[PDB]
Write a protein that binds this ligand. Structure first.
Ligand SMILES: *[C@@H]1O[C@H](CO)[C@@H](O[C@@H]2O[C@H](CO)[C@@H](O)[C@H](O[C@@H]3O[C@H](CO[C@H]4O[C@H](CO)[C@@H](O)[C@H](O[C@H]5O[C@H](CO)[C@@H](O)[C@H](O)[C@@H]5O)[C@@H]4O)[C@@H](O)[C@H](O[C@H]4O[C@H](CO)[C@@H](O)[C@H](O)[C@@H]4O)[C@@H]3O)[C@H]2NC(C)=O)[C@H](O)[C@H]1NC(C)=O
Ligand SMILES: *[C@@H]1O[C@H](CO)[C@@H](O[C@@H]2O[C@H](CO)[C@@H](O[C@@H]3O[C@H](CO[C@H]4O[C@H](CO)[C@@H](O)[C@H](O[C@H]5O[C@H](CO)[C@@H](O)[C@H](O)[C@@H]5O)[C@@H]4O)[C@@H](O)[C@H](O[C@H]4O[C@H](CO)[C@@H](O)[C@H](O)[C@@H]4O)[C@@H]3O)[C@H](O)[C@H]2NC(C)=O)[C@H](O)[C@H]1NC(C)=O
Ligand SMILES: *[C@@H]1O[C@H](CO)[C@@H](O[C@@H]2O[C@H](CO)[C@@H](O)[C@H](O)[C@H]2NC(C)=O)[C@H](O)[C@H]1NC(C)=O
Ligand SMILES: *[C@@H]1O[C@H](CO[C@@H]2O[C@H](CO)[C@@H](O)[C@H](O)[C@H]2NC(C)=O)[C@@H](O)[C@H](O)[C@H]1NC(C)=O
Ligand SMILES: CCOC(=O)c1cncn1[C@H](C)c1ccccc1
Ligand SMILES: *[C@@H]1O[C@H](CO)[C@@H](O)[C@H](O)[C@H]1NC(C)=O
Lengths: 120, 343, 336, 338, 340, 338
């Protein structure tokens, strides 16, 4: 099975995160960044396609955040630019199968990271 | 206007319109000649296939006529009927005499249009991809020109029953979308339209016909075929600067050029149908092969006379042939191109 | 007067109560379906597929006395949908591999009644019929192959066939010619065939193609002859220069194989020697001997006048025997 | 005179109260479908895809007691549009992969009804079907290509198939039917089986066609090239050993010939993993063509480094042809008398 | 009675008297047919045939007041075989060459009604859309391929197409798997096209495909570069080797010609020179020029201290001249097709 | 009892008033559609097309209370055309590229009713399914390919899927053997997939395709290895014969690139370098250095020098095998242990 690890979350500005994947990452060509907070349902943030680079973002962070994939290190990075207070959340990283459904919905993502906190 | 009752009144009037009506008969079968004014709008011409001797064309094919059963009066004059209703109403059965294969596009409802004026005048349009036979001539292969025709007319009804007329007149009745043409190798120099009466085994019929004038573009063949052959002739004549003590070089160099000419001659014909005669490009290939082979015969005689008769006037040949072969090849070219820029 | 309203109810008279399941004169004598064909064109004849593609107009005639009328003077043509409401013969082509009835605007069919009941039913068809070619004489071969027309279900005691106008029933065969073939002759036949379920009527259209040799002069014979003659340059190259004497001949050998493979790959996996297989093997033998002769002289000279004293013969022996080879080959295939 | 309408009334009297959704004798009795085949033409076989295409009239027969009738004529050839209204079995081919029910100018179907209620139903079919070939012995292989068919939904408890004449004379091949250019259709075997699935147990009908490959193509197109390349490599032992460039040319160009020939040969076949009998021939020819160049290399070492090397070429001229002929003879013996 | 027969009665009462031949509000204002697409994949992009095989879920969404129902709060999901008995938009794609609705089991269609009469209707489609390609810069090119959605029978005063959701009306762009390309972006546009029969609404979906040079740079450029480098070794082999100096040059010439031929059976017969043909032309000219330079080393050495010094100097020059000239050519070529 | 007329009228009563547009228990709890498959053949697997073709029997089970009947003990089997009259699920395969229900004789569908109303709906399908592959380990690779199954229109609010039999629900895969691959393992999954329109049930079948190395040893590694070692024959050719070693080396280069193009003839134009490509690059590098070594020798021979040339020849005769051995060791250890 694919297994993922996060790193880069912390307290404040601008910030950047990284998600490293291992295992059968070929069968999981897309990786998504979600976030959650007490009293909130899990929220989508962005997505990226291995080797393609064609991202998509949530309208709440669109034009602030960006996502990119280092295919040699099998790692993906999210640019958490120009922080705002509401961006305080735990930014779970997750992987998506070849033929799963919509990207905005957490239920489609199988393997999940340990959820780094971010604070502003 | 009258949106609440408009649906009701038109469903009622249409049901009254085509009850008792039957599609089995022409409009005015027993009394009149039916005239089917036609028109064509070419969405994209091409591609053209020489190996199949065909061309593929995409068109909106438009027809119109007067059906007297279908006159009506109501709150508006012209009705954009659903294309399903064409199944119940009589429509002409045109067919393209040259058609090899075709698609009446069928995706998300048939690509088909039906409209009805209150005076009974029908209009009936559809999208067709037509692969049509073209009797192209190849005696001048890379420098020829084609007039690939389109011909169509009623299948069942003879000239006594149905007659076709270009809608807006011959000079305006067929249109080409310049932005959509799919020709890569050819250029459509122009198109023209006409009409005919064909006598057939099943009576006499009327044909509408449009001819498309296609002129081939030689550019692909210049760089792919002509240029390699010209310069392989030149290469084979580079032998003449090597001094004849290097017999292995003077041999293998020429032999390699002849092999190159052989492969070029055999391979270039993959783009052509298996005709019963040699094209102009084949004349060029034949003469280039002749010069490359003569560049080897030159050594075949020099290598002999340079040791069989060491008071022979054979050392002269590294001069005479060296300066002459390019001259003869150049005059060949200046006859060939001069011919086929006219022919 | 208002004929449009009258012919309507007359056609309704004809089709009311019409039992489509039963052939004309069911239980009585057969229905005589005369046939016509107009050949539109013949698409690729293929050796690799062993078939040919034929496009045509196909017509059938019969009386269905249930469709007689007298109130209308017209040879009444009807919309083609009526073909799905009348009885029509079950004719099919026994040796077709793939075929389809053309529909561009509407399905290409014709129904034309007449006062006496005769129905003319016509179709435009493209049919890919099997053509078993005898390629042993390729490319100097003629190829007879036919289209076999037969009634699937109704035996000879239910349906009969004939060609309308006899030998003139098929038209357009005088106009069509192919890049690789020319229509020498066509012949029309009629006979019966017997299966375990009964005897059936048969109509068949037979062609007799003859191949055009131009493409084979371009690709097969001239390159092979040129490479063979190029090999003979060895006898004039000095026989001390071993590198050239060899390279020349061995390159001609490899060229023979190369021109054989790229001409054989466009042809089926037939397990027997074609005429051009014999030609290619003869040319290859000539070239192989042209090389092995240099090998011989390079051996014998070293184990002396024995070198020139057979090369000066080879120079004439090769062209003479190759001329004899061509003389026998062409007269054996062309004139006998 | 009335034969054209008496049978309209009869047939409309048979089809009212009729229900084609229910097989005849649904509860009372088993439905025995007598059947047979007539292979009007056989082939081609596409071993690169492991399928073979067969053209056939496929014939079926049974009793539907509901259609038993009386009249002035004791059997009725009827239009195929009636076949959709009568119950007909759902026979399908287990090992078919793409098939055509020919439809030119009419659906190619034949339907006749006897006064006893017995139906005869026939149709022209072209079937592309899987064949389980084993290609370890390629140039001289043989096959049994099966054709297995039976009811799709109705199990053995309901519908059972039987060959019409019982014996092997219930499957026939037309005398002029062979469209195999690459094979001999040597014979056939006809049988039946009870398969079990997740829907019940079906009574399968099975027919096997036995095929053997014609070696004529490969002799001239593949074996002659290999043998002649060995001969072309072998002749270099008669060249004087001082002609190093020509001795090298012979070996390297014949090696190139062998490489291209080997690559071309296995461009065929369905890309299987094991080595066939053609691989064990091309590889041995390549072994000779390579050892010849190695032998020349040994000469050119020793003749220029000096020694009593003159024996080696004279012995090679004996050994190489002798060994190659021995191999050729034993190989062809072990694959001809296999 | 009952919650099953009640829904049955509702549906039958809707389709009692419904006229499939009339568009909604026939004779009234146009019908605003919103639509959106979800991309399944692009199977291939073909230069030989100038088309790309797109597969997608295509949705359409419009009001139809004749299908309004009350009391039932459900968004009825009717069996898709009802869609054959309703009015549906006459939409079509103009540039499609060949397409089909997926038909295994049951034809892949969805239709869902809503209480206020609005209808949702969707299909899963595979379409071989045409896309003419500008190969002048091949393989360093990028292509714009489009799908032209249009209504056939009904004009701009009968239908009004619009992308439902606007910018977000197309999804699944990031699950397109093409080896040779990467979709730089996709863009959505709406327009009114005009024909002799009247104005029509059109929606354009377009992709900008950038090619990946990784395949060609390794498969066709690297061998050419190596063969050209191989061609220079003749300038290190001493000029006494007359036969070998030829053999190398002619073999490299024929090898460049062979690298050429492997392309021509896999590309269209375009009449103009492409970037790849320019590079092959230049490299072949280098090998041909090396061969000529050997020829004029041989001539001057044997036939014409000129017999010694000229040949020595030319041979000494070549070893630096050819590498320098080829490097200049390569730099010029790559900056010509990258920087401008 | 199963009297013919009684069965007819019972079935008519079942269908009389039956509604196609509404799924069973409409408005109530979902329809639990049980799924079952019987694999007949995986026809092909293709890297160039990034897909595989699969032929199968596909079965589905559900109870429609509207079809419950009594007084008949049989599990009635009906003519397949009842499928167009009943409600049947909208199941379809997500990742299929093209598929078709077999239509030989008559469309391959099955419907069998049971007294408790259960319907067994089954049909035979050939489907081409998309599966793009990880070719980076090409000759040593292992692939996962799947068949994805969903309901197109009905969400989890209306339909639920489950494998009827659990882990036993798919059969016939244990008898599948392929020329290029072997099915190491197959695994069955059930999950809910959520779009904007709602949560849709899914079932998916997956195969672990491990490639068989045998083919590529035969067609690629043997030719390349033999032509690589053939290049070392140059060192066994004395530099006195200056014109032969160049011919040998350049012939080896030509043969190596000719072999390489044959792979490009049978592969997708995929960007990245594959392990097969890496091996070919290594072999070509050794051939290129073998030729460049003669060029360097001829430079030194003309720039004691005969001794230098001979010493370089001997040093190469030793080191080229040693360097190639190191290359082979590293290559196989890396691509096996990674
Ligand atoms: C070919 O490719 C496949 C990858 O594409 C390989 O792996 C399979 O891939 C599929 C997707 O294609 C993947 O689902 C499957 O994993 C199993 O899935 C089951 C369903 O899980 C879903 O529903 C559950 C409902 O209970 C739900 O729990 C799951 O989400 C929650 O659980 C997961 C896992 O704990 C959490 O990470 C997540 O945050 C959620 O909380 C999900 O919605 C599931 O039954 C199964 O096992 C898990 O769940 C059980 C019940 O909770 C646990 O008991 C068990 O320990 C697991 O957690 C899997 O997760 C994989 N399959 C495998 C075996 O990895 C294919 O294997 C490959 N095929 C071949 C032949 O090589
Ligand atoms: C292409 O290739 C095909 C296939 O090989 C060729 O097709 C053959 O064409 C020949 C003519 O060239 C056909 O033979 C002719 O057939 C008719 C009809 O004969 C049949 O029907 C008769 C009743 O209508 C019946 O009497 C015949 O039976 C008798 O004759 C046969 C054969 O001689 C014999 O076996 C029987 O025992 C009977 O004696 C038969 O069923 C016929 O008209 C032709 O001439 C005969 O009849 C006329 C009078 O009608 C008479 O004047 C003649 O002297 C002669 O008696 C002739 O037999 C043959 O059937 C075709 N074969 C097939 C398989 O289709 C085709 O010719 C090739 N074309 C080209 C252009 O090369
Ligand atoms: C095709 O044939 C029709 C008649 O079948 C031609 O129309 C007639 O033309 C003549 C003059 O040539 C007139 O005198 C007749 O009155 C016309 N007939 C009718 C019914 O009006 C028609 O011109 C022919 N077309 C061509 C192109 O030759
Ligand atoms: C297929 O199975 C049938 C089953 O028929 C039963 O066979 C048993 C054993 O012989 C017998 O006791 C029963 O009476 C039979 N029942 C009926 C209704 O006939 C066999 O008869 C067939 O031979 C089997 N087919 C093959 C090819 O073995
Ligand atoms: C019989 C003498 O050998 C050959 O003809 C022979 C051997 N290798 C190749 N060839 C030639 C090219 C050939 C192959 C196939 C058909 C015809 C001719
Ligand atoms: C065959 O013809 C019949 C005529 O009724 C038609 O129903 C059927 O669809 C046709 N099939 C094909 C594949 O053309």
């Amino acid at each position: 099975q694919v297994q993922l690890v996060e790193s880069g979350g912390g307290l404040v500005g601008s910030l950047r995160l990284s998600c490293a994947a291992s295992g059968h990452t070929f069968n999981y060509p897309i990786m998504g960044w979600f976030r959650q907070a007490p009293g909130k349902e899990r929220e989508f943030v962005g997505a990226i396609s291995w080797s393609g680079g064609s991202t998509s973002y949530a309208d709440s962070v669109k034009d602030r955040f960006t996502i990119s994939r280092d295919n040699a290190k099998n790692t993906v990075y999210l640019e958490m630019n120009n922080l705002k207070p509401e961006d305080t959340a735990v930014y779970y990283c997750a992987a998506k199968g070849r033929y799963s459904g919509g990207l905005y919905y957490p239920t489609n993502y199988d393997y999940w990271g340990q959820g780094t906190q971010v604070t502003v | 206007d009258e949106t609440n009752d408009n649906i009701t009144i038109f469903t009622r009037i249409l049901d009254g319109l085509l009850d008792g009506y039957d599609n089995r008969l022409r409009p005015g079968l027993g009394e009149r000649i039916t005239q089917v004014r036609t028109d064509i709008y070419v969405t994209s011409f091409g591609p053209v296939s020489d190996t199949e001797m065909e061309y593929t064309i995409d068109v909106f094919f438009r027809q119109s006529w007067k059906d007297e059963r279908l006159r009506f009066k109501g709150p508006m004059q012209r009705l954009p009927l659903n294309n399903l209703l064409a199944s119940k109403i009589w429509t002409p059965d045109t067919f393209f005499h040259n058609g090899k294969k075709s698609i009446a596009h069928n995706m998300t409802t048939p690509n088909k249009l039906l409209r009805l004026e209150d005076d009974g005048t029908l209009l009936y349009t559809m999208r067709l991809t037509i692969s049509a036979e073209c009797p192209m001539q190849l005696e001048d292969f890379p420098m020829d020109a084609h007039a690939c025709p389109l011909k169509f007319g009623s299948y069942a009804y003879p000239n006594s029953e149905v007659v076709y007329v270009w809608t807006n007149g011959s000079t305006k009745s067929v249109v080409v979308a310049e932005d959509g043409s799919r020709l890569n190798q050819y250029h459509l120099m122009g198109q023209t339209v006409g009409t005919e009466n064909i006598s057939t085994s099943t009576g006499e019929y009327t044909i509408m016909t449009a001819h498309f004038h296609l002129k081939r573009k030689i550019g692909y063949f210049v760089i792919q075929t002509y240029l390699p052959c010209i310069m392989t002739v030149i290469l084979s004549q580079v032998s003449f600067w090597l001094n004849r003590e290097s017999v292995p070089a003077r041999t293998v160099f020429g032999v390699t050029t002849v092999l190159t000419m052989t492969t070029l001659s055999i391979s270039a014909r993959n783009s052509l149908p298996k005709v019963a005669y040699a094209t102009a490009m084949d004349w060029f290939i034949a003469v280039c092969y002749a010069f490359v082979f003569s560049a080897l015969i030159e050594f075949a005689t020099v290598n002999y006379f340079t040791k069989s008769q060491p008071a022979a006037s054979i050392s002269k040949i590294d001069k005479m042939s060296r300066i002459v072969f390019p001259v003869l090849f150049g005059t060949f070219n200046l006859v060939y191109w001069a011919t086929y820029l006219n022919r | 007067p208002g004929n449009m309203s009258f012919v309507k109810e007359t056609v309704d008279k004809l089709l009311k109560g019409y039992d489509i399941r039963l052939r004309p004169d069911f239980g009585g004598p057969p229905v005589c379906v005369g046939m016509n064909i107009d050949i539109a064109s013949i698409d690729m004849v293929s050796e690799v597929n062993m078939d040919y593609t034929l496009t045509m107009y196909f017509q059938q005639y019969w009386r269905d006395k249930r469709l007689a009328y007298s109130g209308i003077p017209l040879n009444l043509t009807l919309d083609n949908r009526v073909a799905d409401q009348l009885w029509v013969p079950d004719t099919y082509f026994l040796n077709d591999k793939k075929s389809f009835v053309h529909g561009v605007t509407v399905k290409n069919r014709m129904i034309r009644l007449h006062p006496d009941g005769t129905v003319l039913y016509g179709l435009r068809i493209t049919t890919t019929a099997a053509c078993m070619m005898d390629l042993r004489r390729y490319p100097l071969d003629e190829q007879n192959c036919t289209l076999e027309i037969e009634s699937y279900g109704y035996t000879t005691d239910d349906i009969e066939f004939y060609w309308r106008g006899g030998d003139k029933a098929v038209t357009g065969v005088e106009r069509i010619e192919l890049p690789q073939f020319s229509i020498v002759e066509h012949r029309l036949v009629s006979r019966n065939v017997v299966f375990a379920t009964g005897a059936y009527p048969r109509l068949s259209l037979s062609f007799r193609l003859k191949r055009n040799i131009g493409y084979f002069i371009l690709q097969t014979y001239m390159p092979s002859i040129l490479i063979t003659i190029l090999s003979w340059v060895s006898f004039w190259i000095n026989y001390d220069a071993s590198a050239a004497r060899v390279a020349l001949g061995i390159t001609t050998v490899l060229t023979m194989t190369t021109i054989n493979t790229h001409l054989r790959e466009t042809l089926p996996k037939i397990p027997y020697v074609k005429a051009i297989d014999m030609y290619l093997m003869g040319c290859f033998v000539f070239v192989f001997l042209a090389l092995l002769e240099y090998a011989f002289v390079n051996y014998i000279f070293f184990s002396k006048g024995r070198a020139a004293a057979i090369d000066r013969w080879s120079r004439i022996v090769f062209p003479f025997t190759f001329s004899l080879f061509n003389l026998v080959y062409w007269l054996y295939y062309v004139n006998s």
